[PDB]
């Protein structure tokens, strides 16, 4: 921290996880704050830089209590920064996984219309 | 303290540095606790004493503060008479036009003060001898003052002197020509009172006389006769009626500060870089630095910040041999 | 062995850096001009026993120069010097002695009152009775010295070491 | 300010009293004072302030009177660390312990030793330097020829300096070195044992730095060769001199370097050090290496001074040779040096003064050779048999043997337990000592079958002291309270405990001796866990005689704690509630004791009972959500009507307390309390103390977890004043509170 916020950003992601895994920890023992937590979730990850790699590790430490169904839209936001920084494999199985069918492997039959936004995003 | 120092050092060249040094000094002083405000006003007076001619501009604030601070206190009033002297040294050739600003305190001060601060009037009256130039305008406000304070038994016998003898040194370089005649019959008056004051009476006399010779020969009948009652004579009726060097640098003291070889742990280390630091403000060549050595001891930041500029000196300073060691 | 520290204070412009120059080389000047602080180094040999002093020579304080606080811990001995040819010295001398004796604590310390300029036989202003009467105030121990006058610049140094040595035991 | 003057006169005068207690309570007493009370003002006021405590120093150092230059010595004591090392606190208090350490009274010297050393540790800029000079005075002190005294003194200011403050002392270690061996010889005992002490403690500082150092340090070379200079019979016959003296230094020496080398070893003495009274151990590889090089040079040297008969001698033969087993178990094993060690040890046992360390290490040497041991064991268990009394019969055991039973069962202990069912009877037969209750304590951690034996057996002990009865299937009170503590805190069963509380209920909570209401309330307190536990846990299970016990033994407890004066029996009665407790608080009655014990005079008392009561909101809104809105109707006026800030910290403190244990009620009354403290917190003026924006600061946090879905309206307003708080960087305003606050707004 002494020199630069930019290189101390990468202490920041790890303030980051570990202020959101206190917030699993909360997430776990209140019902009712289960949903104002997750929208904060959602909001600081807003506010997060758009780092493929960050991103994953924040995601991973979300996922301990929050199935991806759950936040659809987050894991929307993140195969599309994936697909934006190249990584065209890890937005297609993550798509994939949010769908939960492959369309590549139902190339003969339409897409899964049950979740359109997924669809859209695939 | 080590601004003063500096300036002590750049006596001839710190002229460069005013802008900066000079303005927020004054804010400090203002708000200040009252002993550390003392303390700065005594530095003050030095700085003024080596900015002499430079300090013009900043003049008129100084004196507003003063102006506000002058409480009849006998230690700041000390310590502001002092500021007086060294600025109607520096002044001297406009502090005319701030001295009525000044008046009042110092007439305020010779009616008031019937205490000790009465030994503090004689240290003002030291300064009035100063204002030479700059008092030939308002010596009729200030000189009634000094009369009735060595015309008044009442104030030491001591103060009685310090404006006897005041008046004495005005009288070399000031106008006594139209009233002062007025004020030879205290003078007179005094001479009927005590032979200590009868002496330098009779020596101040003589001089106000010196001055006043021709319009003196017109009324000095009764002058001479209250004289020869008490018997004395002098000449003059007779003669009517006919910039710093570099400190030395300790090579053994560098070398030893920097013989880390036992220093292990965090804390040891830091300890080391601290003492070294300090060493090397301590033994720099540059006055300026050893100056500010004391803060840098108080006040670790200070020795981090000129760590670089204390090496360079000594580096500068050391014997190819010793800059390889 | 032996070692010691001694701080030598006074108003400036006075014997202080010309004094301790003068015992640690044996030559005196006009250089040297008013200093920050100085750090000197000398063995001794008193009461055939070795000692090693480091001198230093102070910032000369007037009569409201805060008193620093580097010399009120390690220094364990005091010369207190004003020039014989200044009466203001000699007042700065008395009000400096006063700040360290608040400073320093109660602790019996000590102190060595030294006039320095005695050679100035044409323009002293302070004699031998007044730095004498006002060292048996302090109950300090007093000097003359001037200089030039090395060897006894030399036993005022002795002096102050003797003055610890003898009341450190009792 | 004249008001604080004339408290310095009566501190002065308390501390001028020769009463040690007096001395102590004054002292704290001003302590407090400058804590708190001084903090209120400026930092120039500050120093003059200390001027004049210095003014007070003198006037308790003036006299040469041993007391009242304790009664100063205490005072810089208490000054020093507990505000800001100032310059003229460092540079008076440093001149004023300098005079002293010369002195004659060796009590005198250790404080003023100790108080250097916390002068050291001030932490002033200045340090760096001040301990440089001190350090070097007191080796110059070493380097005198005479003047026992200095050297005394010389030597334990060294060891403070070293153990308080090891920065600077590492620095001046290599010079220390040199004298402090010359020190070390001294023919007087208490220098000699000081300065092995101040060894210890710069050996300690060479250790914790010795693995980051790529060079071997000589430094414990050289302390073994004069180890061995002082064991030459050359060098012995240097007259003037008790070779006793010199055998002593060598073998203290020696304990050192073991005890740096083998700090296994000195973790097993820490064992025993803690048992018999009811810090961190590092080695050193260039010693261990040196010591294994050496240790049979070592074995010879200690078995050959063994024989003698110097009582201190023996005291540091015994000390240190189980150091070296438990350095070395198998050169004692296989050399056989052990029989020499368990024949001396039994054959030093049999004198008083030896044979106190003598059983301790026993107990070492045990646990060092944890298999040979066996051997020997059919002659240690009878001495010890014989120093507990036999069934027959002032008979007073010394509570080291005790010790050494606990750790001789850590090895031995399985095969043991068949003899130590023997040795029960006659322990509880010597009558109660913390000490034994410890090593029971210890002996039922080992082996169950010994547990339930010490279990019946110390009931049937405490049937006999306490009750006055015999067990079924005046009265010294320091016993009473061991007792008693020992049957709250060790673990027991059966129904003859329910009696005990029942008769302490009765005849012990109302004793009128002071501690023993305290320990009685603690004890029973205690003693209800497992009844309760199985009444609210185990429903099923439920005796309503023991709910009735519960409530009865409960009630006077209440009763207790709202009826006698003084506060500490209320505190720790109140500290004493539970969880458990709750389910049968609920009541009216006891409700209302609580209720009553919260308006209590004391401060601390309030802020429990306010914690409890919030804690009981749960179970029966009914009585206590009333009380709970009038008393915050009460706190409201007084923080916004009370003119003391003292009131002011004490509302916020149990609005605090209220909303972190009753937040429910404070859920729809989350407006106008927030409302209130941001008013506090715009209050132009600030209180004496900082304290009331902390407890404001901490009751936003508290509101804030639960309430901070509807707070996300009013985040912003507090938020700023909260940023000029912490952008204020003179205000302290316990920051970790104020940080503490902002993270759990942003949270919640
Ligand atoms: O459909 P999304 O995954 O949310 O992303 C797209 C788009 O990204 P693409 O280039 O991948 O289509 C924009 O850029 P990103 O924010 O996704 O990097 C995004 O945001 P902006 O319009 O602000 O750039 C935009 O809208 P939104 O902010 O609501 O996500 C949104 O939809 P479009 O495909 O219609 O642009
Ligand atoms: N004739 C004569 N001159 C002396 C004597 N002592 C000092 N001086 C001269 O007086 C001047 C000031 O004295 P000095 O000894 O240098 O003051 P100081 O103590 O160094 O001044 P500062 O550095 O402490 S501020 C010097 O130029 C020095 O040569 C003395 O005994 N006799
Ligand atoms: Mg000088």
Known sequence: AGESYSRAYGAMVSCHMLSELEEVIQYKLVPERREIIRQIWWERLQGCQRIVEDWQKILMVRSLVVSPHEDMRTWLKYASLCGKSGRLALAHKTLVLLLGVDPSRQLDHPLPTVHPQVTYAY | QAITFIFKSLGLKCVQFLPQVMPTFLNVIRVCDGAIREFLFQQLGMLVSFVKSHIRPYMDEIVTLMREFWVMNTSIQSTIILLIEQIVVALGGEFKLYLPQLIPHMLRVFMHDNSPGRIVSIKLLAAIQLFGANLDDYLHLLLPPIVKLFDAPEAPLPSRKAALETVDRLTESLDFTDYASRIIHPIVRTLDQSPELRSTAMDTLSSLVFQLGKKYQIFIPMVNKVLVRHRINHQRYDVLICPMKKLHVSTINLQKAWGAARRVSKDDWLEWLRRLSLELLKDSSSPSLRSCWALAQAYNPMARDLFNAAFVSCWSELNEDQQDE | ?170 | TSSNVSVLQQFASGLKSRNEETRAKAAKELQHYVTMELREMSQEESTRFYDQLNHHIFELVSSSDANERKGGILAIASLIGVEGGNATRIGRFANYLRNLLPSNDPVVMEMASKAIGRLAMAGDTFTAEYVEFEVKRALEWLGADRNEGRRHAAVLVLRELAISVPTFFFQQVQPFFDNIFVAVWDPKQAIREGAVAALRACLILTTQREPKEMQKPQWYRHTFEEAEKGFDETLAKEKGMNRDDRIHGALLILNELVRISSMEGERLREEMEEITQQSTLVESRCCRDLMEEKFDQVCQWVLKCRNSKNSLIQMTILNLLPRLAAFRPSAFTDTQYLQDTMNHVLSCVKKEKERTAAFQALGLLSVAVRSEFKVYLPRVLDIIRAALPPKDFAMQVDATVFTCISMLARAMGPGIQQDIKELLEPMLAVGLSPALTAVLYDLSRQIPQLKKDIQDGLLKMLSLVLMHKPLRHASDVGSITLALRTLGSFEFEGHSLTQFVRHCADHFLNSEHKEIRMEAARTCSRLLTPSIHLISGHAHVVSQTAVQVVADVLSKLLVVGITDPDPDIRYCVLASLDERFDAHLAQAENLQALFVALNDQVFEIRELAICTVGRLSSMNPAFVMPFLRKMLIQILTELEHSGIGRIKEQSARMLGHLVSNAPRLIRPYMEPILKALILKLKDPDPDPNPGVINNVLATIGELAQVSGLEMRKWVDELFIIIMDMLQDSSLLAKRQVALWTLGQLVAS
């Open chain 3, 1 to 170: 062995s032996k070692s010691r520290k001694i701080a030598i204070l006074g108003y400036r412009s006075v014997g202080k850096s010309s004094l301790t120059i003068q015992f640690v080389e044996g030559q005196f000047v006009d250089s040297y001009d008013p200093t920050i602080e100085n750090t000197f180094t000398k063995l001794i040999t008193v009461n055939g026993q070795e000692y090693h002093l480091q001198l230093v020579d102070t910032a000369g304080q007037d009569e409201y120069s805060i008193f620093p606080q580097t010399y009120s811990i390690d220094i364990n001995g005091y010369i207190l010097v004003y020039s014989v040819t200044s009466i203001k010295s000699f007042e700065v001398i008395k009000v400096i002695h006063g700040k360290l004796l608040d400073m320093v604590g109660k602790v019996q310390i000590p102190i060595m009152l030294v006039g320095n300029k005695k050679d100035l036989h044409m323009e002293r202003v302070i004699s031998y009775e007044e730095g004498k009467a006002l060292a048996e105030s302090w109950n300090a121990a007093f000097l003359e010295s001037s200089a030039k006058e090395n060897q006894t610049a030399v036993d005022v140094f002795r002096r102050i070491i003797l003055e610890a040595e003898k009341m450190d035991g009792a």
